[PDB]
UniProtKB/Swiss-Prot annotation:
Protein name, per record: Galectin-16
Presence of keyword Membrane: no
Keyword terms of this UniProt record: Apoptosis, Lectin
InterPro entries per the UniProt record, alphabetical: ConA-like_dom_sf, Galectin-like, Galectin_CRD
Source species taxonomy: Eukaryota, Metazoa, Chordata, Craniata, Vertebrata
Domain of life (superkingdom): Eukaryota
Pfam families per record: Gal-bind_lectin
MF terms in GO: carbohydrate binding; lactose binding
Function (record text): Binds lactose with high affinity. Strong inducer of T-cell apoptosis.
Domain Galectin: residue ranges: 6-138
Tissue specificity statement from the Swiss-Prot or TrEMBL entry: Predominantly and highly expressed in the placenta where it is localized mainly in the syncytiotrophoblast and in the endothelia of fetal vessels. Also detected in the amnion and chorionic trophoblasts in fetal membranes.
GO biological process, alphabetically ordered: apoptotic process; positive regulation of T cell apoptotic process
Organism: Homo sapiens (Human)
Length: 140
């Protein structure tokens, strides 16, 4: 099966207990730009609110934030970067009552407290130079 074409957009509806599962491979192929970006938008429109934004800078940091009323808010930085150049990853973003639980390759790495209710998310975009196998939302 061919990798998904990026930028990859997916209409979604998230509730507590939903899980976004993103499988792919990152490569060290960018200059001053992240190797993976994931944005959760409140409308099917790139100017809308971003409830959750994650980007990967291989060997440096995982960055998380929101974009509310056009403004990037408090940046949350991790220096634990489980993603590796050319190796497959399994990224899970689980919607809890108070936070997203961010999980990579079976490790719990961060709890991002909700800033916009996740019930307002309508579209996920996964982009940058990722070789993307699948993006799906499970309800349960
Ligand atoms: O916070 C997410 C936001 O980051 C912007 O870049 C930041 C960068 O993370 C920070 O280290 C630097 O000091 O300031 C920059 C803001 O100009 C990205 O431009 C944006 O797309 C998001 O990734």
């Amino acid at each position: 099966m061919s990798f998904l074409t990026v930028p990859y957009k997916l209409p979604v509806s998230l509730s507590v207990g939903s899980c976004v599962i993103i499988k792919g491979t990152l490569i060290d192929s960018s200059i001053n730009e992240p190797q993976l970006q994931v944005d959760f938008y409140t409308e099917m429109n790139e100017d809308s609110e971003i409830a959750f934004h994650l980007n990967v800078h291989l060997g440096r940091r995982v960055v998380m934030n929101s974009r509310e009323f056009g403004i990037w808010m408090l940046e949350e930085n991790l220096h634990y970067v489980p993603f590796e150049d050319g190796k497959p990853f399994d990224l899970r973003i689980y919607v809890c009552l108070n936070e997203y639980e961010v999980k990579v390759n079976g490790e719990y790495i961060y709890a991002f407290v909700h800033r916009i209710p996740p019930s307002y998310v309508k579209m996920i975009q996964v982009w940058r130079d990722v070789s993307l196998d699948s993006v799906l939302v499970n309800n349960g």
